[PDB]
Design a protein around this ligand. Sequence first.
Ligand SMILES: [Mg+2]
Ligand SMILES: [Mg+2]
Ligand SMILES: [Mg+2]
Ligand SMILES: [Mg+2]
Ligand SMILES: [Mg+2]
Ligand SMILES: [Mg+2]
Ligand SMILES: [Mg+2]
Ligand SMILES: [Mg+2]
Ligand SMILES: [Mg+2]
Ligand SMILES: [Mg+2]
Ligand SMILES: [Mg+2]
Ligand SMILES: [Mg+2]
Ligand SMILES: [Mg+2]
Ligand SMILES: [Mg+2]
Ligand SMILES: [Mg+2]
Ligand SMILES: [Mg+2]
Ligand SMILES: [Mg+2]
Ligand SMILES: [Mg+2]
Ligand SMILES: [Mg+2]
Ligand SMILES: [Mg+2]
Ligand SMILES: [Mg+2]
Ligand SMILES: [Mg+2]
Ligand SMILES: [Mg+2]
Ligand SMILES: [Mg+2]
Ligand SMILES: [Mg+2]
Ligand SMILES: [Mg+2]
Ligand SMILES: [Mg+2]
Ligand SMILES: [Mg+2]
Ligand SMILES: [Mg+2]
Ligand SMILES: [Mg+2]
Ligand SMILES: [Mg+2]
Ligand SMILES: [Mg+2]
Ligand SMILES: [Zn+2]
Lengths: 99, 208, 126, 155, 116, 60
Amino acid sequence: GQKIRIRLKAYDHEAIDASARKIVETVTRTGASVVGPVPLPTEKNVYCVIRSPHKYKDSREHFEMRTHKRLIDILDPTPKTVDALMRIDLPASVDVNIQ
Amino acid sequence: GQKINPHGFRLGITTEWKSRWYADKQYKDYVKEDVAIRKLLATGLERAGIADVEIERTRDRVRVDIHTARPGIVIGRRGTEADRIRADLEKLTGKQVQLNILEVKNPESQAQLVAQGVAEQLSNRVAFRRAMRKAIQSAMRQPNVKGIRVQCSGRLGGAEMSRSEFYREGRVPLHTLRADIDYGLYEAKTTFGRIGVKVWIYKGDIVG
Amino acid sequence: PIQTVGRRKEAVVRVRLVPGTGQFNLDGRTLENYFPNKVHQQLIKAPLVTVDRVDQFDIYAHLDGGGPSGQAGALRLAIARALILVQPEDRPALKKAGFLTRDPRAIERKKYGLKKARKAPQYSKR
Amino acid sequence: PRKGPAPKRPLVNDPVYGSQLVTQLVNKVLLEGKKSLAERIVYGALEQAREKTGTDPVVTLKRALDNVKPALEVRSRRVGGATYQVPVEVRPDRSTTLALRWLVNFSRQRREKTMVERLANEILDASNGLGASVKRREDTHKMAEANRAFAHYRW
Amino acid sequence: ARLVGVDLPRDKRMEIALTYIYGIGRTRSNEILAATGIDKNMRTKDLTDDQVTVLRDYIEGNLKVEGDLRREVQADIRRKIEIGCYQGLRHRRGLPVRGQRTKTNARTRKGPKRTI
Amino acid sequence: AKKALVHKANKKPKFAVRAYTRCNKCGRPHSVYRKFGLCRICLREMAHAGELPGVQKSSW
RNA sequence: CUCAUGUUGCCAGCACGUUAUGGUGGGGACUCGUGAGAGACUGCCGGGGUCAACUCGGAGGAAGGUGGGGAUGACGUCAAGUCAUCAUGCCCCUUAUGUCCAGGGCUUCACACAUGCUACAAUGGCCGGUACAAAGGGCUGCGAUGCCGUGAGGUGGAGCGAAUCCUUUCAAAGCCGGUCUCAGUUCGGAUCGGGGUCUGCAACUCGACCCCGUGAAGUCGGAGUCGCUAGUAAUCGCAGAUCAGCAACGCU
RNA sequence: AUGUGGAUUAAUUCGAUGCAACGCGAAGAACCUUACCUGGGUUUGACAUGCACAGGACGCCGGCAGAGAUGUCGGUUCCCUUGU
Ligand SMILES: [Mg+2]
Ligand SMILES: [Mg+2]
Ligand SMILES: [Mg+2]
Ligand SMILES: [Mg+2]
Ligand SMILES: [Mg+2]
Ligand SMILES: [Mg+2]
Ligand SMILES: [Mg+2]
Ligand SMILES: [Mg+2]
Ligand SMILES: [Mg+2]
Ligand SMILES: [Mg+2]
Ligand SMILES: [Mg+2]
Ligand SMILES: [Mg+2]
Ligand SMILES: [Mg+2]
Ligand SMILES: [Mg+2]
Ligand SMILES: [Mg+2]
Ligand SMILES: [Mg+2]
Ligand SMILES: [Mg+2]
Ligand SMILES: [Mg+2]
Ligand SMILES: [Mg+2]
Ligand SMILES: [Mg+2]
Ligand SMILES: [Mg+2]
Ligand SMILES: [Mg+2]
Ligand SMILES: [Mg+2]
Ligand SMILES: [Mg+2]
Ligand SMILES: [Mg+2]
Ligand SMILES: [Mg+2]
Ligand SMILES: [Mg+2]
Ligand SMILES: [Mg+2]
Ligand SMILES: [Mg+2]
Ligand SMILES: [Mg+2]
Ligand SMILES: [Mg+2]
Ligand SMILES: [Mg+2]
Ligand SMILES: [Zn+2]
């Protein structure tokens, strides 16, 4: 049994949902076993900053590094399926890691 | 400080982001190149108002989208400024890149455009009263915008003292995050010194 | 299959019941050898004595988050909820006891400018 | 407290004995939030008193509470350029609260090398009237009953 | 008891009794007890003179304590103050040499709090 | 930030020790963050410009 | 709470594991992970209310009446702070007030004030055993098992750009047993002497950490003064970050 | 242990001072960060733009003299084309 892992790699929830939709549609068309876009714990980075120069340290401003990751374990890695995902072009929002 | 940036506050739900990508190790290189390009393009292009910029990037290739009220001098009919900027990016070593130019729909309701125009008139000869009244009237003329506010702080008229004044008309729910608000600013040119101007623009709301 | 969960102050436990005897299995170690604090045993034992059906169910406990008090309270609320889950006929009595309502209060946001929680540095006006 | 009453917490009951007063005792003995060790110390002191006196722990504790429970407190009010001492009656909640807090805060100090024995010894002294809690009740009664007059304010 | 001019405690754990001697600290007391085979929980009431003899042998054979330490430390201090090292300069000035917050703290080497 | 200091910092050091960030946009000895490669008020300004892939207000 | 949904994450229920454990075949029966939706709107009842706003009490429900906490600073005040982030008008130097290193100082020290840590000790110290958290970082970086070192640390170096691999199976208090019987103390840790490591071209001013000796002051604190009304107060540990080290008890 | 007034030193850089400065810039000073001193030079320059007058070199890898920056000597040498 051979399985190909696809790591979806970006911030935006809407973009990640759209990418999952496109990948799932391509897999369904090509006829390959796909579980779906398995959710992954969203890594949240926090960075705090004071809002003023030269002291006034009591006031600050916050941030997040909100990264969304999804797991799509497509079984039965059909060749034509592999070429389809390789040739698929996706918006620059999400990063695709084929493993 | 008095008011946070409405754009920065509303990045999440209302507004959108002007550059999208996500890579960590070279992220510093990304920001370095982005800042260099932005500063050099701001220094170069001054005749045509570069309303907005946008950076879409994948692997080596990068794409730039810029908004201006008019592309007549942005891109030459032959492409003089076009290939000029291509040369700047190539010597910046941008890898694969292309330029997309889009013209604003209503330039009078755009935060940066109106601010820059009124500020240029002020820097040339226009008194603050006439300039700001023209700005407000021309902006309210379009029925798209119903609440807009503009502020200019500095030594008005060359005085040895700095004023704090503004004119409001309509509704600007800054504390309402649902509100569609556009912020701008620019540092004016004056023989006596420099003067800052801040502009608030409200254009409807989004529900859902 | 009957299952119940407990979340509070990061204290989370997955609880499985069985009408069998009242044996205690906390991660494979009985309650007596698992966190032997009289107060904790009281809190765990309270819901079953409240239902007045002692030694009529067995439990399997898997705990995460928090410390001894957190796990004890999470498991206690777990049995409190699972009892109604299996038998809703005791709902009036168990709600009068208040067991079904999880205590929705935990670590609060640590705000900048404060040493921790909502305390503030020592103040001097001189 | 300027809108009305803040709801009070319905604390749990001590299972082994069945008295919320003992729970209140343990909460007052609580320092740095170590309830396990607090209950340990309370059990140690109560067992020491049990084996010392040969009496029912609940009965002895009720006797001590009744003996050391006050019935009037003094309030200070400044009018006309000076502060005045004025008393006011307290509820049984307040009475037990004061009694327990005294007992604890004065067993805190004795110097016989073990607070675990200090608790039991002072419980015995309160039971037999010799307790420092008895002494403090005596002095507070002195202060209060020296002034029934200022009650005309009724503030 | 008595030990090399150091009064052994009448009733205390030997790991503290030996630490009473100048040249030993808790760690060395533990190691010494382990080496000599004596436990660290008995009382001085079970002390035996043969054991005292064995501790004296081991200490004098494998340690330097008391007057020897005094003379050695004094010799080093005087040598480094004579040489002119910054260590000796700090010693002469009466201030810490490690470079701590000698402005607010260092009251230990400055003596009890004296006010101008 | 003296241009001489900026140039000296950017030039390859004679030893690996003489390396420091000196935020590129404005070269600040202190208050610089490596991951974003920019100074502190500089990052705040850039974030209010809104052209950074991931910076957003934090509250929870 | 309902839905989707099983790997690196779980185990209802079947098998192999046979000491190393869901470890392995198997399965969504739950958390778990993150998307969508629902649910508190005085929704309903009584009392009063000007029959109006609204209050108190009762059933429901998880919360009842802004459920809790953040972000969110109205016009303005203080010519309040910041030309040493940046840029900016004027003046001033230019053969210098520019430039590089001929090293050193930025901490120095007779004294107070500002905010913390360490404690002043038995609800504790030390010794051995023993279970539980979250979140997060990691490339000219995080760093496995292993060996040598008391321990900094050295050899060697798997797995990781990363729910996986390293940050220990991420703990501390917690619980069990032994010592200490109230001592300037087995508390207490600075100061000082001698021996090393690490980063680095080179640790004298002017680093950090380890081991040995060091044994000072100090007993809850003077008027007055800080903060704290629910996981709040207090006490314990952890991590992000500036960094090559490191004065990291600081901020978050 | 570090901040702050203050005094001493050739430097003890500088900014900030009640509520709303003071483990505040400084979220790390052996050389840098370093803006301050005694201490060798150096100068259209360490660092870029443009006008002229001579250049194919600039630019790259080593040894000697020195406490280092100092300068001298060894190795390679322009890409276009007749305007640069
Ligand atoms: Mg602070
Ligand atoms: Mg907390
Ligand atoms: Mg303050
Ligand atoms: Mg460095
Ligand atoms: Mg920076
Ligand atoms: Mg399962
Ligand atoms: Mg206002
Ligand atoms: Mg001002
Ligand atoms: Mg200046
Ligand atoms: Mg300037
Ligand atoms: Mg300026
Ligand atoms: Mg200095
Ligand atoms: Mg310094
Ligand atoms: Mg300093
Ligand atoms: Mg202050
Ligand atoms: Mg200690
Ligand atoms: Mg242990
Ligand atoms: Mg263990
Ligand atoms: Mg969580
Ligand atoms: Mg070993
Ligand atoms: Mg004492
Ligand atoms: Mg000590
Ligand atoms: Mg000690
Ligand atoms: Mg004392
Ligand atoms: Mg007083
Ligand atoms: Mg309140
Ligand atoms: Mg502590
Ligand atoms: Mg660092
Ligand atoms: Mg200064
Ligand atoms: Mg001040
Ligand atoms: Mg601090
Ligand atoms: Mg330098
Ligand atoms: Zn910057």
